[PDB]
Structure formats: C-alpha cells, structure tokens
Design a protein around this ligand. Structure first.
Ligand SMILES: [Ca+2]
Ligand SMILES: [Ca+2]
Ligand SMILES: [Ca+2]
Ligand SMILES: [Ca+2]
Ligand SMILES: [Ca+2]
Ligand SMILES: [Ca+2]
Ligand SMILES: [Ca+2]
Lengths: 132, 143, 132, 132, 143, 143
C-alpha cells in the first residue's frame, strides 16, 4: 500500500495572497510535501484527506482567508474573523480526489497568518485514504 | 558569532557576557517561547555602558535570515539606538517571535505571561516601573 | 476494501433546526451521501470518521449550533459564537461506529449557517476508516 | 490494518495546565485511550492522526490553550481566544509518528475548558493510519 | 437516595414529591441539557414550606462527585439558605451543568433558552417577574 | 431567458445589452464571488431609461429557485422599484450571494472587497459618491 501522510506547522509569518509554506515539518511520510514551496504534490492517484488549521495573527488584521487550493481552483475556503483582533483559526477539512501532479496547498486569501516557530499553531495535515 | 538564549523566564546579562568574543561583530538572540502567550520586556542600563568603538543595535524579527536583518538595518526607521538614548534606563517591549541584539553595564529581560502573569514576572516588571516619561506596562497592576 | 468517503460544501444558507444539506459535493465515493436530504447513510457497517466545518452566517446571529447527529442522537456538538457577529466556525470531529442505515448528518441547533455557492466555506467531510 | 481509533467528549470542566481527560468515550477501539488519565498510549508503532476540538468556557476566561502533547513535548498548539468571552474552539489536527509507549494527550496550557456532559462539544479524536 | 429529573423545559415539584423517602437525607437533581444554550431559573415558595427538622441546601455543580459536594458545603460562602430567606419567594439563576437540592410547599424551575427563548419559556419567566427587590431577568422582555 | 455575469470586478451594461432578447420577460444576474469578502454596489442611470412598457425589478437572493423569486415578489415589501425612483441616479448595496435584475440607459456595478478594497474598486466608488441624500459608503475614504 502507498503511505502518504504529512503534517507541518507554520514556522514563519505569512501575509497577503501567498501560498503557505509550512516549514515546521513534523511528518512528511513519503516526502510528498515540500516546505520550500508549501505544496503537496500528488504522485499516486487516489482520494486524499487534507485538513489545515491556520491561526490568524493576533493584533493586526481582523480577517484572514486560508483557502485549500487544488491546482488552480479553491477546493475549500476558511475565514478567520474577529472584530477584536483575536487569535481565531481559519481551518477546514477536505476529501479531494487527486491525480498525479495535483498540487494541493493552503493559500492565504487576504490576511496575515501567524508564525508559530516550533509551536505548531497553524498546521497543514493530510493523508491518502485510498489509492485508485 | 551567534548565540541564542532559548529557555529563560528571566535573565541578566552584562555586555561582556552577552558578547564573549574578541570580534566586535556578534549577535545575541533571545527566542520568545510563545508570542501568543508571552511578551518579552527588555531593560537597558547605561550606568557604565559605553559606545566609544561599539554600536548597539536593538531590533526584533520573526525568522532567522541574514537578508532580513540586512533589509531591516537598511530600513533604519524604527531600530532602537541604545547608545544615543537620552534616558539612563531604556525600557523596550517586544511582542515578536525573536529578539536579537547585535554588536558592531548589563541588561535584563523578562518573558512575561501576557494574560496570566506569574507572581515573579509581575514582581520584576513592577520594579521596572521605576522609569523616572512614557512606558508600556501590562495588565497586571502593582504599586 | 470498501471505499466510502465524501466531502461537500454548503451551497445554500440554512437556519434554525434543519438538517444541513451540503449540496456542493466534491467527493461522494460510493454515493453514500445524499445532498438532497443531507444525510450520510451507512451501508457497510464499520468505524467511520466524520468532520464538519459549518461557517456561522456573518452579520446576523451571534451564536450557532451545528451538532453531528447520528440517527436520533447528538454524537457531537459545535457552537460558533461571536458577540460582534463575525464568521466563526461551528466545527467538530467525530469517530463513530455505524451500522447499516445509521444516518449521520449535521443539523443546525439554532442560528443561521452560511451559503457559499461553490466557495465551500462550510463543509461536511467523512470517510470509513475500518469495516467490521 | 490493526484497528485503533477513538473519540471522546469532555464530560467534566477543566482548568489550568492539566491533562484533559475526555471521559465521554464514544469509540475506544483497542482500548488505547484511557479516560481516567486522558492519554492515548500507543502500542503498535505507526503513523497516527489525532484531532482535538476543545471548547473554551463562556463567561470566565478570555483565552485558552490546548496543546496536543506527545510525551514531554508539544506537537501542536491551539489557542481559543475571544475578547468578549464567547465560546471558541482551541482545535488542531496532527499526523504524528508514534512508538509504543508514546502518550498523546491534550493538555490545557492556560484557560478553562468547557465541560459538556453528554453533549460532546470538546472532543478528542484520533486513529492509526498506518502500522509502520 | 438520588433522583435526577433529566429532560424538562419546565417542572413543578412539591417538597413531598421531590423527596419521596422517609430518610431525611436525600438529594434532588436537575440536569441542565446544555449550558451553552440554556440557563436554568429556580423559584422557591415558602407559603407552606417549613424547616422545623429539615435543612434546605440549594447549590450547583458541574460533575457528580461526593467530595465536590462536601467541599462546597464546607465552603459555605455562597450556598443558598432557603429556610433563612426573608422574602417569601426565592428566585435563583444557575447557569451551570447541574442543579441539586438536597434534604438534611412546592418549587418550580425553567430550562430557558439563553439566546432564543421560546414563547412558553419567556411567558413563565414573565410571571416570575412578580417578585414584589433585586432579580435576574433575561433578554426577552414582557410587560 | 437567464444569463449570469459571473466573474467581473466591475461592469457597465446598457439596458439593451443586459436584455438582448425580444421577449420582455428576461432575467439578468450577477453572482457575488464571495460575500464573506465582497460587497456588490449597484448604480442605476435614469438619464435615458424608460418604463413605458417595461417593469424594472431589482432584488437579491441566495440560491437559484423560481419559487423563491415568486415568494420574494409576492412579499413586495423591500423590492426596489427602479422606474418609480425619484432621484435620477439609484445607488444600491447588495451584500448577498446573488443579484438578479429581471425585465417585465445603462447601469454599472462594482464587486468591491469588503475589508481591503482595491485601488480601482475604491476609485470607482469614490466617483459614485457624487449622489447629489442618503448613501451607503465603505471603510475606504476618498475626497
Ligand atoms: Ca476565496
Ligand atoms: Ca445540542
Ligand atoms: Ca473559531
Ligand atoms: Ca504551548
Ligand atoms: Ca471568535
Ligand atoms: Ca470576538
Ligand atoms: Ca467587542
């Protein structure tokens, strides 16, 4: 069986509309996630489950959108909003079908994420459930 | 030349201790364990501090990157100038992931808990309240 | 051996105490989720994992309860609350044992959900982990 | 695949830097989760997925930290914060590699968790994905 | 001796009905279905209630634990004394998971919805508004 | 007869362009890409717009359902009457998933970003500020 599963915290703060690069890689079983680019590139076709928790940076920015983007389409959207500028999460979970080359990644869509260093507040988890 | 003091609620460092190298170019770093939870308060003493042939740069950042430090230095719009500080004691608050002091008379810091300050932490800060003057003090109150 | 896994966003907004019908189906392996009714009907008995993220409707309603109901009983409860009426998620995650016919569904227990068209802010994910 | 999977809600209120004991056990396949201590002790080494949702108490308490601790180290951190003292979740998901004896548990790192009785607001889910 | 009335939006209980045992040591409990959603309001009638050889202890808690009840009783700083209440009618609010009345003339409670009170629920509370005097009332308003 | 203009930050449509059909019963729709993020502002020009044998119904909804449109029309309590508008220019804000204008002289809309309006988006709205008069304007400020 194929063993694909990863989890990585967000070591560095992000902002704007940039792909989140979760460099705090705890698990990268199969090495199908690349912290340098921040994209999970499928290699074995199959149905994968991805969950991401992205902590909105506290203090500045009352809204943050973190969309799990599959290739060039937004396959999930999460909004972390707090009018008092608190640490609310923009989290969501997806069960997507993926073909080889499909780059699944979390992209900020108009907010400032939180750089947890080694704390691993903002995370990106995901694993293959079945292989086609 | 880069040493980082990772886990300390409190710490007192002399200028000689934080830069124990003959080379004048060194960086001393203090990692905030959790900025969601802790705010690092810095204290600077100019009682015997001298800058005849040394430059004291006080700044903060989020990740280790030499290019980031160079860009911040080229910015030079909010970097603290310890040597050119009129007041004898300099109080700084740094609610960011890293604090680094580089070298180009001691100083003490405090990793306080932001929302539930410990008994020791709010006590040390209450002593630092003797600034004189604008200061930044936390939620916990003490005479 | 059996491949059951679904994911669907909430195309239409909801309100009150009605079963959430996530009609934005991205994955419906085995066709064991019905967007018309909004219920995942188990057919192969086994241990299933379900996660749901339900975005509270911003602007109106300061609290929203989305309980993952198994048959006629609340197997999980999630409350999205924000006194400033922001977009907070009533998300939760369960690992339930299911027999054939057990209809697992996300049911609002107060408050108004958010309808995101194809955005998929509010989702319902779930897959079978083991079969008996 | 050996069958390890659990899910449990928070029957009793919790507060301060103490391990969360999710005693409202719905699934405890393999009996690898102990509600009396609140720790999932791995026995068969492998890659496990854990998710926890921890509702913080409304009323008293403005911020609550719930870190999924693996043995003596924080493998994920979640902060539930609301300046208006609302209900918010300190949730996060992890995909950790575990050896026999590793004790994964959710420990509050400040603030008070909500005791949901049988409601199962605050939950702790997790299952083994691969047996090494 | 412990009976718990689990599912009721409203309930009227006489002293004899809530303690239908010869033994004077009994506990009557009312489980709040969801404290995130509901706030239980209690009402006490002293028209025929007597405490010649009975103690009425009104308190709340979160989980079933005898040591917790003993510690709360030894606290004795916020436990209601129904017998030693000057006003004829006693109104109490308990926004906690459990409500227990132990024995050592009736009383009615109300499991109201905190944010969206039902038509019947707010009607019952509006009738309890006839206290006389400080009372606790919810958002829903009624003349 | 139903065309929907899905992806546009801005768009100028004449009455003839938005209803390019001989049949007088047609619907013109504008999908809000993300109501969590964007608020659609509508602008109506009555300089050459006429309603001699045409009815202009301006309304919003959340999902495509004919029964929903019929029920909204029968409600007739908040549907805009473009023909019966005293002011020459009509400004409307629609923070809902769909905007549809049905037919029973142009008009321009603007898919503005709610929290971080773009340079062009706030520029267009600042030009619409020339109403004259009560109007709805957003956080972004422009003389
Ligand atoms: Ca988006
Ligand atoms: Ca419920
Ligand atoms: Ca939240
Ligand atoms: Ca921590
Ligand atoms: Ca919140
Ligand atoms: Ca708030
Ligand atoms: Ca507020």
């Amino acid at each position: 069986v194929p063993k694909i599963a990863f989890y990585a915290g967000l070591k560095r703060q992000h902002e704007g509309y940039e792909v989140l690069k979760f460099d705090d890689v705890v698990t990268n079983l199969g090495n199908h996630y690349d912290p340098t680019t921040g994209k999970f590139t499928c290699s074995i076709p199959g149905i994968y489950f991805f969950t991401y928790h992205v902590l909105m940076r506290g203090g500045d920015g009352t809204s943050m959108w973190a969309d799990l983007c599959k290739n060039n389409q937004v396959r999930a959207s999460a909004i972390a909003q707090d009018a008092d500028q608190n640490y609310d999460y923009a989290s969501n979970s997806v069960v997507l079908h993926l073909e080889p080359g499909d780059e699944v990644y979390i992209k900020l869509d108009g907010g400032k994420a939180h750089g947890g260093n080694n704390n691993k507040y903002s995370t990106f988890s995901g694993f293959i459930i079945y292989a086609d | 030349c880069s040493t980082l003091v990772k886990g300390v609620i409190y710490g007192s460092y002399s200028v000689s201790e934080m830069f124990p190298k003959n080379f004048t170019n060194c960086t001393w770093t203090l990692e905030n364990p959790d900025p969601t939870k802790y705010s690092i308060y810095l204290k600077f003493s100019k009682k015997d501090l001298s800058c005849s042939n040394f430059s004291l740069l006080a700044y903060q950042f989020d990740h280790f990157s030499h290019e980031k430090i160079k860009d911040l230095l080229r910015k030079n719009h909010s970097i603290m100038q310890l040597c050119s500080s009129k007041n004898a004691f300099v109080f700084l608050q740094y609610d960011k992931n890293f604090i680094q002091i580089r070298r180009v008379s001691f100083f003490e810091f405090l990793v306080l808990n932001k929302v539930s300050p410990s008994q020791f932490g709010c006590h040390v800060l209450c002593t630092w309240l003797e600034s004189c003057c604008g200061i930044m003090y936390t939620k916990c109150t003490c005479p």
